[PDB]
A paper describes a structure:
Here we characterize a metal-dependent, bifunctional [name] from the leaf beetle [name] by structural and functional analyses. [name] in [name] (PcIDS1, EC 2.5.1.1) produces FPP in the presence of [name]+, but preferably forms [name] when exposed to the heavy metal ions (HMIs) Co2+ or Mn2+. Inter- and intramolecular cooperative effects in the homodimer strongly depend on the provided metal ions and regulate the biosynthetic flux of terpene precursors to either biological defence or physiological development. Strikingly, a unique chain length determination domain adapts to form geranyl or farnesyl pyrophosphate by altering enzyme symmetry and ligand affinity between both subunits.
Author numbering:
A (entry chain A): 87 to 328, 334 to 427
B (entry chain B): 86 to 183, 202 to 327, 334 to 426
Write the structure that this text describes.
């Protein structure tokens, strides 16, 4: 919605001022001005789906009579703390992957006189969201649960990143590690917690929903939606309309995992030889093998089956949680 | 630090590793939790844990003797290990920038908040403590960035080497997390929340922090291994050299400061000797010692002298 996008974007400039121009650290204006540019470059140029989903989650969890402009704005500020967390992770991930571009612009680490100083900027941006939480939430009962959620999700996302790294040795993929079990774990910890659980749990906390059973039931369905989301993303890297590099980078992708499940030994040897090679021909050989194993058809079947299984699980969701919130998320991801 | 203090502090470390690597929770990701255990084990508990043990000593000298139970001294130890987890994250980041993965520094920093939640979430000091770590982390990152703004394209920006910028770099990059953080944690655990008590403690500890780094900078060049000159660091020696230099002496700093050639390091050292930086350091060491001793003697707001005298005498030896 137009109103939601505009209300959300209007908050960002206030957060930059809160972090760089609140009359604090006035002895060091050169580093506060630089930090403004770090935030301005890395935080607000994406689709901001996670931050906006934090607002939508709150709007569907809170009692209608409690939805004031002021409370909706607080949900906006929590949304931007999610976008600050993501900004920090992607600054670091782009350095780790040595990627060229993110959101159509040169990766932050490639900018002049940054490189490995991107590590410090990563830590700085992540640290900044706790300053935003203190300013706007320190007087509310959801303060400590929200701080704890952000620290725990950061920890879990790091476990996800590190598990991803244990699928590679010396810039070569370990194909024996590419099991559906490990893939599912990587998706859960590396992406699902910060993408799906974090926005909804923030919505619940701001709506003073602290029942751990409610958070556990929410998590169960959001982890399942998370798995389809990443599997679809993995499928599109290879078979989407154009610039995917999963094959070249030797990533533990759903396609690589399913390919290795369905491969005869000669097909296996093509993966061993060619998966994660920098030569464009090697990328084409893996793509050709994926076509040969019928992965497009496999994905189409998984897309229909997973949709039906998740919708079934949403209907079984115990009273207290709005089914509409989870159906709305499914509708966003499946476009259906 | 006493033998009993060192041993009871060290006995906590294996508990923290098990808390962070989910031992007995039966995790779905044992391969990466076992790796993280090794990250903590290899990088956190080795050498002198001076910040960690200082947190315990600060607590013991701030708390009412009646409240110094084994249980409370152990909580001071865990707070100390949270400071050592922060120290370990900062060392890992320095190592990456010069087995460790790039995200290990973020992960180790993140882990201290898991430890604070586990052991302190029930205490009135919980929120002040986590807010202190948040603010110190932010300020440390600012210090690191300000240090980086003294270098461009691998060449030092000598116009940036002012005493004001130096003092700021030390305060933000080092002093907040090394000197203030241990004492503030001790105060919070002892239920000392008075902002004026934290402010008076902060004033003295920032002054001790400045001497610590100036002495460290002095010894890098004149100690009995040092690379500050080669790396083109914003050192107290470089700053004072530029204050004292005539134009011909400035031109030697421009030409030779931050060069990889060993000869360039010797030229800068010869200039430091010429400009009388040894004697200038000796004068500053005496004047700073007397000013800090005076501030400790004048310490009010019901703060104990002996904690600050002990910190001062440890750094000045
Ligand atoms: C601890 C850290 C730094 C976590 C990284 C989290 C993250 C979302 C990385 C992107 O993974 P990717 O490289 O598979 O995806 P993308 O295509 O977005 O780069
Ligand atoms: Mg990447
Ligand atoms: Mg990556
Ligand atoms: Mg992708
Ligand atoms: Mg040194």
């Amino acid at each position: 919605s137009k109103e939601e996008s505009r209300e959300f974007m209007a908050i960002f400039p206030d957060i930059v001022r809160d972090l760089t121009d609140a009359g604090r650290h006035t002895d060091i204006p050169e580093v506060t001005k630089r930090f403004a540019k770090v935030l301005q470059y890395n935080v607000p140029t994406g689709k901001k789906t996670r931050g906006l989903s934090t607002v939508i989650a709150y709007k569907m969890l809170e009692k209608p009579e409690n939805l004031t402009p002021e409370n909706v704005r607080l949900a906006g500020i929590l949304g931007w703390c999610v976008e600050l967390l993501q900004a920090s992770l992607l600054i670091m991930d782009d350095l780790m992957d040595r990627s060229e571009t993110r959101r159509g612009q040169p990766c932050w680490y490639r900018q002049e006189n940054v490189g490995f100083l991107a590590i410090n900027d990563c830590l700085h941006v992540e640290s900044s969201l706790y300053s935003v939480l203190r300013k706007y939430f320190s007087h509310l009962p959801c303060y400590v649960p929200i701080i704890e959620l952000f620290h725990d999700v950061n920890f879990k996302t790091n476990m996800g990143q590190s598990l991803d790294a244990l699928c590679m040795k010396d810039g070569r993929p370990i194909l024996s590690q590419f099991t559906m079990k490990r893939y599912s774990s990587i998706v859960k910890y590396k992406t699902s917690y910060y993408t799906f659980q974090l926005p909804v749990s923030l919505g619940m906390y701001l709506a003073d929903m602290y029942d751990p059973e409610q958070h556990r039931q929410a998590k169960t369905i959001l982890m399942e939606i998370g798995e389809f989301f990443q599997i679809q993303d993995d499928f599109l890297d290879a078979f989407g309309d154009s610039v995917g590099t999963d094959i070249k980078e030797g990533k533990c992708s759903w396609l690589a995992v399913v390919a290795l499940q369905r491969s005869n030994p000669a097909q296996r040897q093509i993966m061993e030889e060619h998966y994660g090679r920098p030569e464009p021909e090697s990328t084409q050989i893996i793509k050709n093998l994926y076509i040969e194993l019928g992965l497009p058809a496999t994905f189409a079947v998984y897309e229909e089956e997973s949709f039906n299984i998740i919708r079934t699980h949403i209907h079984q969701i115990s009273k207290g949680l709005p089914h509409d919130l989870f159906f709305k998320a499914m509708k966003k991801i499946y476009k259906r």
